[PDB]
mmCIF file of C-alpha atoms in Angstrom:
data_model
loop_
_atom_site.group_PDB
_atom_site.id
_atom_site.type_symbol
_atom_site.label_atom_id
_atom_site.label_comp_id
_atom_site.label_asym_id
_atom_site.label_seq_id
_atom_site.Cartn_x
_atom_site.Cartn_y
_atom_site.Cartn_z
ATOM 1 C CA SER G 1 23.511 -6.997 11.605
ATOM 2 C CA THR G 2 21.500 -10.219 11.052
ATOM 3 C CA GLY G 3 17.980 -11.038 10.643
ATOM 4 C CA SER G 4 16.232 -14.410 11.094
ATOM 5 C CA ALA G 5 12.526 -14.986 10.180
ATOM 6 C CA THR G 6 10.373 -18.171 10.065
ATOM 7 C CA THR G 7 8.682 -18.860 6.798
ATOM 8 C CA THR G 8 5.425 -20.994 6.800
ATOM 9 C CA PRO G 9 3.662 -22.866 4.067
ATOM 10 C CA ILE G 10 0.510 -21.375 2.956
ATOM 11 C CA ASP G 11 -1.341 -24.772 2.501
ATOM 12 C CA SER G 12 -1.206 -28.399 2.931
ATOM 13 C CA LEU G 13 0.580 -28.881 -0.176
ATOM 14 C CA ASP G 14 3.521 -26.290 0.455
ATOM 15 C CA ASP G 15 2.341 -24.568 -2.825
ATOM 16 C CA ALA G 16 4.368 -21.245 -1.424
ATOM 17 C CA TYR G 17 5.597 -20.013 1.723
ATOM 18 C CA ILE G 18 4.977 -16.665 3.549
ATOM 19 C CA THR G 19 7.356 -14.769 5.928
ATOM 20 C CA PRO G 20 6.066 -11.953 8.134
ATOM 21 C CA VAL G 21 7.420 -8.417 7.116
ATOM 22 C CA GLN G 22 7.310 -5.257 9.128
ATOM 23 C CA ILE G 23 6.560 -2.140 7.058
ATOM 24 C CA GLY G 24 6.396 1.469 8.076
ATOM 25 C CA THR G 25 5.991 3.119 11.309
ATOM 26 C CA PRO G 26 4.178 1.941 13.577
ATOM 27 C CA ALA G 27 5.020 -1.308 11.899
ATOM 28 C CA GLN G 28 2.305 -2.818 9.566
ATOM 29 C CA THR G 29 2.920 -6.428 9.399
ATOM 30 C CA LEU G 30 2.333 -8.242 5.996
ATOM 31 C CA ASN G 31 3.024 -11.850 4.970
ATOM 32 C CA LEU G 32 5.197 -11.859 1.978
ATOM 33 C CA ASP G 33 6.267 -14.560 -0.475
ATOM 34 C CA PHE G 34 10.146 -14.462 -0.440
ATOM 35 C CA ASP G 35 10.922 -14.864 -4.149
ATOM 36 C CA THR G 36 14.646 -15.370 -5.185
ATOM 37 C CA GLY G 37 13.349 -15.471 -8.841
ATOM 38 C CA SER G 38 12.454 -11.801 -9.029
ATOM 39 C CA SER G 39 13.389 -8.366 -7.692
ATOM 40 C CA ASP G 40 10.587 -6.293 -6.637
ATOM 41 C CA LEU G 41 9.088 -5.884 -3.116
ATOM 42 C CA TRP G 42 5.384 -5.126 -3.774
ATOM 43 C CA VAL G 43 2.422 -5.261 -1.582
ATOM 44 C CA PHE G 44 -1.403 -5.216 -1.413
ATOM 45 C CA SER G 45 -2.403 -1.719 -0.303
ATOM 46 C CA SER G 46 -4.817 0.978 0.326
ATOM 47 C CA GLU G 47 -4.385 1.722 -3.190
ATOM 48 C CA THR G 48 -5.268 -1.584 -4.633
ATOM 49 C CA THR G 49 -8.605 -1.824 -6.548
ATOM 50 C CA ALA G 50 -11.236 -2.652 -4.082
ATOM 51 C CA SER G 51 -12.504 -5.557 -6.257
ATOM 52 C CA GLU G 52 -9.182 -7.217 -6.509
ATOM 53 C CA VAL G 53 -8.599 -7.456 -2.702
ATOM 54 C CA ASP G 54 -10.103 -10.506 -0.952
ATOM 55 C CA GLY G 55 -8.772 -11.245 2.414
ATOM 56 C CA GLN G 56 -5.349 -9.775 2.148
ATOM 57 C CA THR G 57 -3.640 -7.550 4.630
ATOM 58 C CA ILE G 58 -2.815 -4.146 3.113
ATOM 59 C CA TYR G 59 -0.117 -1.638 3.554
ATOM 60 C CA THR G 60 -1.640 1.872 4.370
ATOM 61 C CA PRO G 61 1.009 4.141 3.418
ATOM 62 C CA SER G 62 -0.842 7.411 4.652
ATOM 63 C CA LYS G 63 -0.652 5.583 8.236
ATOM 64 C CA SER G 64 3.256 5.259 8.192
ATOM 65 C CA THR G 65 5.032 8.547 9.511
ATOM 66 C CA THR G 66 8.111 7.015 7.620
ATOM 67 C CA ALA G 67 6.434 6.635 4.183
ATOM 68 C CA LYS G 68 7.247 8.864 1.357
ATOM 69 C CA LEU G 69 5.905 8.908 -2.115
ATOM 70 C CA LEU G 70 8.540 8.178 -4.664
ATOM 71 C CA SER G 71 7.637 10.839 -7.177
ATOM 72 C CA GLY G 72 6.822 9.678 -10.675
ATOM 73 C CA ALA G 73 7.946 6.082 -10.069
ATOM 74 C CA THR G 74 5.712 3.194 -11.407
ATOM 75 C CA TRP G 75 6.246 -0.493 -11.586
ATOM 76 C CA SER G 76 4.755 -3.379 -13.605
ATOM 77 C CA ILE G 77 5.591 -7.005 -13.446
ATOM 78 C CA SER G 78 4.698 -10.331 -15.111
ATOM 79 C CA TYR G 79 5.623 -13.620 -13.721
ATOM 80 C CA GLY G 80 6.255 -16.931 -15.352
ATOM 81 C CA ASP G 81 3.105 -18.301 -14.198
ATOM 82 C CA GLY G 82 1.194 -15.727 -16.114
ATOM 83 C CA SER G 83 0.344 -13.635 -12.954
ATOM 84 C CA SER G 84 0.948 -9.792 -12.962
ATOM 85 C CA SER G 85 0.603 -6.688 -10.787
ATOM 86 C CA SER G 86 1.441 -2.941 -11.060
ATOM 87 C CA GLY G 87 1.185 0.281 -9.231
ATOM 88 C CA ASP G 88 3.393 3.043 -7.684
ATOM 89 C CA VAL G 89 6.007 3.296 -5.373
ATOM 90 C CA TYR G 90 6.863 4.590 -1.602
ATOM 91 C CA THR G 91 10.003 4.341 0.268
ATOM 92 C CA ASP G 92 9.683 3.248 3.900
ATOM 93 C CA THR G 93 11.279 1.316 6.863
ATOM 94 C CA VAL G 94 11.174 -2.473 6.257
ATOM 95 C CA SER G 95 12.302 -4.970 8.651
ATOM 96 C CA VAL G 96 12.664 -8.650 8.336
ATOM 97 C CA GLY G 97 13.356 -10.910 11.444
ATOM 98 C CA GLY G 98 14.930 -7.991 13.391
ATOM 99 C CA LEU G 99 16.978 -6.698 10.266
ATOM 100 C CA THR G 100 15.903 -3.148 9.319
ATOM 101 C CA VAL G 101 16.270 -1.361 6.059
ATOM 102 C CA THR G 102 15.404 2.414 5.854
ATOM 103 C CA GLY G 103 14.538 4.079 2.542
ATOM 104 C CA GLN G 104 13.306 0.766 0.946
ATOM 105 C CA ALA G 105 11.357 0.859 -2.082
ATOM 106 C CA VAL G 106 7.883 -0.476 -1.333
ATOM 107 C CA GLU G 107 5.824 -0.895 -4.363
ATOM 108 C CA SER G 108 2.059 -0.501 -3.990
ATOM 109 C CA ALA G 109 -0.159 -2.419 -6.052
ATOM 110 C CA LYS G 110 -3.009 -0.579 -7.873
ATOM 111 C CA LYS G 111 -3.953 -3.654 -9.763
ATOM 112 C CA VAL G 112 -3.276 -7.216 -9.423
ATOM 113 C CA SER G 113 -4.351 -10.439 -11.511
ATOM 114 C CA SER G 114 -6.912 -12.806 -10.506
ATOM 115 C CA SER G 115 -4.391 -15.370 -9.049
ATOM 116 C CA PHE G 116 -3.032 -12.803 -6.341
ATOM 117 C CA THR G 117 -6.803 -11.914 -5.584
ATOM 118 C CA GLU G 118 -7.736 -15.441 -5.176
ATOM 119 C CA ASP G 119 -4.881 -16.036 -2.798
ATOM 120 C CA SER G 120 -5.891 -14.693 0.466
ATOM 121 C CA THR G 121 -2.594 -15.650 2.255
ATOM 122 C CA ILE G 122 -0.099 -13.897 0.338
ATOM 123 C CA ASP G 123 -0.061 -10.076 1.042
ATOM 124 C CA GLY G 124 2.805 -9.417 -1.544
ATOM 125 C CA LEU G 125 6.270 -10.452 -2.807
ATOM 126 C CA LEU G 126 9.685 -9.762 -1.519
ATOM 127 C CA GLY G 127 12.100 -10.189 -4.548
ATOM 128 C CA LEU G 128 15.484 -11.687 -3.694
ATOM 129 C CA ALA G 129 17.063 -11.965 -7.252
ATOM 130 C CA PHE G 130 19.505 -9.351 -8.438
ATOM 131 C CA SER G 131 18.427 -5.794 -8.665
ATOM 132 C CA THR G 132 18.935 -5.588 -12.198
ATOM 133 C CA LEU G 133 15.561 -7.276 -12.596
ATOM 134 C CA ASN G 134 13.612 -4.615 -10.670
ATOM 135 C CA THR G 135 10.893 -3.032 -12.509
ATOM 136 C CA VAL G 136 10.588 0.522 -11.196
ATOM 137 C CA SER G 137 10.623 3.124 -13.778
ATOM 138 C CA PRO G 138 12.211 5.560 -14.341
ATOM 139 C CA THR G 139 14.626 4.864 -11.559
ATOM 140 C CA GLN G 140 15.433 1.155 -10.888
ATOM 141 C CA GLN G 141 15.275 0.274 -7.234
ATOM 142 C CA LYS G 142 17.342 -1.946 -5.106
ATOM 143 C CA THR G 143 15.949 -5.335 -3.464
ATOM 144 C CA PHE G 144 15.832 -5.671 0.405
ATOM 145 C CA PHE G 145 18.961 -7.881 0.355
ATOM 146 C CA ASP G 146 20.882 -5.491 -1.779
ATOM 147 C CA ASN G 147 19.906 -2.530 0.524
ATOM 148 C CA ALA G 148 20.817 -4.563 3.775
ATOM 149 C CA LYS G 149 24.018 -6.219 2.386
ATOM 150 C CA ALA G 150 26.742 -3.791 3.516
ATOM 151 C CA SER G 151 25.384 -3.773 6.977
ATOM 152 C CA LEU G 152 25.245 -7.527 7.287
ATOM 153 C CA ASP G 153 27.734 -9.463 9.210
ATOM 154 C CA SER G 154 28.431 -11.474 6.040
ATOM 155 C CA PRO G 155 26.893 -10.539 2.570
ATOM 156 C CA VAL G 156 24.718 -13.841 2.592
ATOM 157 C CA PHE G 157 21.187 -15.063 3.065
ATOM 158 C CA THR G 158 19.981 -18.399 3.538
ATOM 159 C CA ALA G 159 16.898 -20.342 2.734
ATOM 160 C CA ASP G 160 15.780 -23.413 4.702
ATOM 161 C CA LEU G 161 12.252 -24.267 3.581
ATOM 162 C CA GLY G 162 10.208 -27.077 5.349
ATOM 163 C CA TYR G 163 8.422 -30.062 3.839
ATOM 164 C CA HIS G 164 4.903 -29.732 5.077
ATOM 165 C CA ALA G 165 6.406 -27.580 8.087
ATOM 166 C CA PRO G 166 7.763 -24.050 8.807
ATOM 167 C CA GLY G 167 11.249 -23.101 7.805
ATOM 168 C CA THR G 168 13.597 -20.238 8.142
ATOM 169 C CA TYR G 169 15.113 -17.193 6.175
ATOM 170 C CA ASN G 170 18.315 -15.930 7.610
ATOM 171 C CA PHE G 171 20.235 -12.787 6.576
ATOM 172 C CA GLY G 172 23.824 -12.100 7.449
ATOM 173 C CA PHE G 173 25.124 -15.442 8.838
ATOM 174 C CA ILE G 174 25.054 -19.177 8.225
ATOM 175 C CA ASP G 175 23.565 -21.162 10.963
ATOM 176 C CA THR G 176 25.972 -24.175 11.276
ATOM 177 C CA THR G 177 23.298 -26.129 13.225
ATOM 178 C CA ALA G 178 20.804 -26.007 10.455
ATOM 179 C CA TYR G 179 22.434 -28.568 7.876
ATOM 180 C CA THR G 180 24.434 -31.822 8.031
ATOM 181 C CA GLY G 181 27.550 -32.397 6.592
ATOM 182 C CA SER G 182 29.230 -29.643 4.612
ATOM 183 C CA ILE G 183 27.957 -26.882 2.379
ATOM 184 C CA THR G 184 29.067 -27.295 -1.529
ATOM 185 C CA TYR G 185 29.312 -24.119 -3.192
ATOM 186 C CA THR G 186 28.955 -23.649 -6.809
ATOM 187 C CA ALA G 187 29.328 -20.793 -9.508
ATOM 188 C CA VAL G 188 26.429 -18.467 -10.274
ATOM 189 C CA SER G 189 25.957 -16.374 -13.402
ATOM 190 C CA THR G 190 24.089 -13.070 -12.947
ATOM 191 C CA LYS G 191 23.634 -12.594 -16.625
ATOM 192 C CA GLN G 192 20.057 -12.964 -16.500
ATOM 193 C CA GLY G 193 19.360 -11.453 -13.083
ATOM 194 C CA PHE G 194 18.841 -14.735 -11.438
ATOM 195 C CA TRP G 195 20.652 -17.092 -9.115
ATOM 196 C CA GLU G 196 21.710 -19.209 -11.946
ATOM 197 C CA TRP G 197 23.778 -22.285 -11.644
ATOM 198 C CA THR G 198 24.670 -25.590 -13.242
ATOM 199 C CA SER G 199 23.677 -28.900 -11.665
ATOM 200 C CA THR G 200 26.112 -31.698 -12.483
ATOM 201 C CA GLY G 201 23.428 -34.330 -13.069
ATOM 202 C CA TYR G 202 20.695 -36.610 -11.456
ATOM 203 C CA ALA G 203 19.488 -39.907 -10.362
ATOM 204 C CA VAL G 204 16.013 -41.436 -10.073
ATOM 205 C CA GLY G 205 15.394 -43.430 -7.122
ATOM 206 C CA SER G 206 18.027 -45.930 -6.171
ATOM 207 C CA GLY G 207 19.540 -45.815 -9.970
ATOM 208 C CA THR G 208 22.923 -44.674 -11.231
ATOM 209 C CA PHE G 209 23.675 -41.159 -11.208
ATOM 210 C CA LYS G 210 23.830 -39.427 -14.721
ATOM 211 C CA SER G 211 26.600 -36.949 -15.141
ATOM 212 C CA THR G 212 25.125 -34.160 -17.295
ATOM 213 C CA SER G 213 25.045 -30.284 -16.853
ATOM 214 C CA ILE G 214 21.622 -28.701 -16.204
ATOM 215 C CA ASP G 215 21.710 -24.904 -16.137
ATOM 216 C CA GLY G 216 18.954 -23.667 -14.053
ATOM 217 C CA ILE G 217 17.845 -21.124 -11.414
ATOM 218 C CA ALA G 218 17.310 -21.287 -7.697
ATOM 219 C CA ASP G 219 13.886 -19.814 -7.189
ATOM 220 C CA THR G 220 12.023 -19.936 -3.953
ATOM 221 C CA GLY G 221 8.889 -18.256 -5.581
ATOM 222 C CA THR G 222 8.290 -21.233 -7.982
ATOM 223 C CA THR G 223 6.442 -24.264 -6.230
ATOM 224 C CA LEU G 224 7.787 -27.198 -8.555
ATOM 225 C CA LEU G 225 11.084 -28.466 -10.017
ATOM 226 C CA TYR G 226 11.066 -27.753 -13.841
ATOM 227 C CA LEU G 227 13.678 -29.695 -15.792
ATOM 228 C CA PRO G 228 14.506 -30.966 -19.375
ATOM 229 C CA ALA G 229 11.943 -33.177 -20.795
ATOM 230 C CA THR G 230 14.598 -36.068 -21.062
ATOM 231 C CA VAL G 231 15.145 -35.795 -17.332
ATOM 232 C CA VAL G 232 11.537 -35.680 -16.416
ATOM 233 C CA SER G 233 10.386 -38.372 -18.688
ATOM 234 C CA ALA G 234 13.283 -40.717 -17.044
ATOM 235 C CA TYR G 235 11.752 -39.719 -13.475
ATOM 236 C CA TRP G 236 8.074 -40.550 -14.471
ATOM 237 C CA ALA G 237 8.994 -43.597 -16.417
ATOM 238 C CA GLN G 238 9.777 -45.344 -12.859
ATOM 239 C CA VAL G 239 6.046 -44.607 -11.797
ATOM 240 C CA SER G 240 3.483 -47.200 -12.928
ATOM 241 C CA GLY G 241 0.570 -45.210 -14.767
ATOM 242 C CA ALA G 242 2.253 -41.903 -14.932
ATOM 243 C CA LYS G 243 1.640 -39.847 -17.989
ATOM 244 C CA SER G 244 2.018 -36.390 -19.386
ATOM 245 C CA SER G 245 -1.482 -34.942 -19.728
ATOM 246 C CA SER G 246 -2.008 -31.895 -22.180
ATOM 247 C CA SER G 247 -5.583 -31.272 -20.361
ATOM 248 C CA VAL G 248 -4.254 -31.117 -16.810
ATOM 249 C CA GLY G 249 -1.012 -29.184 -17.869
ATOM 250 C CA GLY G 250 1.795 -31.715 -17.046
ATOM 251 C CA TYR G 251 2.617 -35.277 -15.343
ATOM 252 C CA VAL G 252 -0.137 -36.797 -13.409
ATOM 253 C CA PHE G 253 0.341 -40.262 -11.584
ATOM 254 C CA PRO G 254 -2.079 -42.473 -9.731
ATOM 255 C CA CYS G 255 -2.628 -41.313 -6.201
ATOM 256 C CA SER G 256 -2.032 -44.989 -5.045
ATOM 257 C CA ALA G 257 1.561 -44.775 -6.143
ATOM 258 C CA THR G 258 4.895 -44.711 -4.212
ATOM 259 C CA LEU G 259 6.998 -42.339 -5.534
ATOM 260 C CA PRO G 260 10.879 -42.701 -5.881
ATOM 261 C CA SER G 261 13.332 -39.997 -4.646
ATOM 262 C CA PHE G 262 15.033 -37.605 -7.102
ATOM 263 C CA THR G 263 18.624 -36.803 -6.693
ATOM 264 C CA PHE G 264 20.359 -33.705 -8.245
ATOM 265 C CA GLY G 265 24.090 -32.963 -8.246
ATOM 266 C CA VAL G 266 25.898 -29.695 -6.750
ATOM 267 C CA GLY G 267 29.428 -30.370 -7.882
ATOM 268 C CA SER G 268 30.551 -33.704 -6.379
ATOM 269 C CA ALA G 269 27.778 -33.583 -3.647
ATOM 270 C CA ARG G 270 24.381 -34.712 -4.015
ATOM 271 C CA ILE G 271 20.939 -33.572 -2.724
ATOM 272 C CA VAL G 272 18.266 -36.337 -2.466
ATOM 273 C CA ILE G 273 14.412 -35.234 -2.828
ATOM 274 C CA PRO G 274 12.261 -37.706 -1.163
ATOM 275 C CA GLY G 275 9.523 -39.070 -3.054
ATOM 276 C CA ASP G 276 6.767 -37.681 -1.012
ATOM 277 C CA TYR G 277 8.082 -34.212 -1.737
ATOM 278 C CA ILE G 278 6.991 -34.562 -5.504
ATOM 279 C CA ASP G 279 3.400 -35.453 -4.621
ATOM 280 C CA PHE G 280 1.095 -32.402 -5.151
ATOM 281 C CA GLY G 281 -2.282 -34.313 -4.513
ATOM 282 C CA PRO G 282 -5.306 -34.804 -6.346
ATOM 283 C CA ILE G 283 -5.672 -32.668 -9.446
ATOM 284 C CA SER G 284 -9.083 -31.872 -8.434
ATOM 285 C CA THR G 285 -10.920 -32.675 -5.105
ATOM 286 C CA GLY G 286 -11.741 -36.199 -4.839
ATOM 287 C CA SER G 287 -9.761 -37.380 -7.818
ATOM 288 C CA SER G 288 -7.428 -40.544 -7.689
ATOM 289 C CA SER G 289 -5.080 -38.510 -10.170
ATOM 290 C CA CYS G 290 -2.340 -36.871 -8.553
ATOM 291 C CA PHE G 291 -0.215 -33.871 -9.811
ATOM 292 C CA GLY G 292 3.592 -34.525 -10.152
ATOM 293 C CA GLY G 293 6.187 -32.016 -8.436
ATOM 294 C CA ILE G 294 8.612 -32.628 -11.182
ATOM 295 C CA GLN G 295 7.563 -31.106 -14.619
ATOM 296 C CA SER G 296 9.135 -30.414 -17.966
ATOM 297 C CA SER G 297 10.492 -26.907 -18.455
ATOM 298 C CA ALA G 298 10.291 -27.362 -22.359
ATOM 299 C CA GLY G 299 8.863 -23.929 -23.534
ATOM 300 C CA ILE G 300 9.576 -22.060 -20.238
ATOM 301 C CA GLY G 301 13.065 -21.496 -21.743
ATOM 302 C CA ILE G 302 15.031 -21.956 -18.471
ATOM 303 C CA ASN G 303 14.986 -24.831 -15.859
ATOM 304 C CA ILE G 304 13.898 -23.963 -12.425
ATOM 305 C CA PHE G 305 14.941 -25.403 -9.135
ATOM 306 C CA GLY G 306 11.883 -24.375 -7.255
ATOM 307 C CA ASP G 307 10.589 -25.282 -3.958
ATOM 308 C CA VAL G 308 10.362 -29.041 -4.294
ATOM 309 C CA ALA G 309 14.334 -29.165 -4.778
ATOM 310 C CA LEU G 310 15.226 -26.366 -2.616
ATOM 311 C CA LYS G 311 13.196 -27.619 0.519
ATOM 312 C CA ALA G 312 15.654 -30.830 0.452
ATOM 313 C CA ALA G 313 18.531 -28.407 0.984
ATOM 314 C CA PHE G 314 19.953 -25.967 3.239
ATOM 315 C CA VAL G 315 20.570 -23.246 0.590
ATOM 316 C CA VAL G 316 23.106 -20.397 0.781
ATOM 317 C CA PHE G 317 22.597 -17.305 -1.356
ATOM 318 C CA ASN G 318 26.046 -15.849 -1.272
ATOM 319 C CA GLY G 319 26.112 -12.006 -2.346
ATOM 320 C CA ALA G 320 29.787 -11.561 -2.205
ATOM 321 C CA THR G 321 31.365 -9.505 -4.974
ATOM 322 C CA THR G 322 31.321 -12.650 -7.100
ATOM 323 C CA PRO G 323 28.087 -14.368 -6.036
ATOM 324 C CA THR G 324 27.801 -18.041 -5.379
ATOM 325 C CA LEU G 325 25.336 -20.677 -4.248
ATOM 326 C CA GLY G 326 25.759 -23.144 -1.478
ATOM 327 C CA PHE G 327 23.844 -26.438 -0.874
ATOM 328 C CA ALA G 328 23.847 -28.721 2.190
ATOM 329 C CA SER G 329 21.774 -31.886 3.150
ATOM 330 C CA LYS G 330 19.787 -31.294 6.154
#
């Protein structure tokens, strides 16, 4: 089997991407944030504290003839951005782009933090990291991909995120029309539960490539590119007037600037992030200070190849017995 679904930016900045997901019988379609940095499929629901729901579409398990309470199971998750959610668990039928999993754990939120409430466009998350990170207790549950994998034509999924435009998540096949050149594959460590890999270096604009190992994670659920402070300083030094602002929470730059590109290495291959992908717009409405899309990972504890990086590539998440990651230009 295969599946193919379009993923759409939630706003004009590509702050996140939503993908429609069918849950239950009859189908209830929710727009979920596919997150290769976590491993829970959780949804706003009829059980979510009413004051914490503001415009989201909810899953109502009592209206699904295939929903079953997973007795005694609870979940609770905290994300790198400080947001969180928790609740109980059902199993139900879940379909993405025509690919169906029966008995998928659907984690129903009883509580969500303010940032989730405040984002009316995201109805929940669909985790695509390794199932070892799943938070369900006392019996850990599998991700949608883990459940689907054996049925897929090939044990892979691909992320093809758009810049200010829709893109695609495919399951079970590699669309050879979706990228240019070849796909370069690189080793993955699953030791921390992430799609963790090592970039071979970087360049800023038309500058020379610096060969240096940068360990980090391919994370579709993180907006920005978080890299070591040395790398980030080298980038922003090429933008007149750019500075790190403790009050704003990162590097800012004059909105009048033209940003240089940023290149990262995948083995001997190179992925070029155009400068415009690094512009996240005014820090507040009407400001002429703009927020940068490349930020320091110092104090996160891990480098994160988030959407800024991933949307410059066609990315293969290869879930073979020994997982790997592939990157192609597009």
